[PDB]
């Protein structure tokens, strides 16, 4: 649907504070696919096709990237750094470099791009 992100939500997951559960969830919500308690399914209906189209299951960032690629479609040069260019983010230190934090950064760049696509 046509959710807004804060600076606040991005940072939360650059710190610590969502988890490999929460911040998938908070992609799935944006783009629409929003779990339909009643239906026991994800619903398409308040996604764009171009998403829902070939995704019968939500996109683990986590494990996988198939919609790493997709991701990449909405989120054009000029908006590569939207991590420093609204927050300062940049990437992490060594000591931090983990698997796991790591393929959080991917899905949060994304999520800039769609909040400032927004007021185009």
């Given at each position: 649907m046509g959710i807004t992100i804060t600076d606040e939500l991005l940072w939360a997951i650059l710190k610590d504070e969502l988890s490999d559960a929460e911040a998938n969830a908070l992609v799935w919500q944006a783009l629409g696919y929003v779990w339909d308690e009643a239906q026991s399914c994800w619903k398409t209906d308040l996604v764009a096709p171009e998403w829902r189209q070939d995704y019968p299951e939500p996109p683990?960032?986590?494990?996988?990237?198939?919609?790493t690629v997709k991701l990449t479609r909405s989120i054009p040069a000029p908006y590569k750094q939207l991590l420093k260019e609204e927050l300062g983010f940049a990437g992490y230190s060594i000591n931090e470099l983990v698997p796991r934090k790591t393929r959080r950064a991917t899905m949060t760049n994304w999520l800039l791009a769609y909040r400032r696509s927004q007021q185009d």
């Open positions: 683990d960032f986590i494990a996988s990237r198939p919609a």
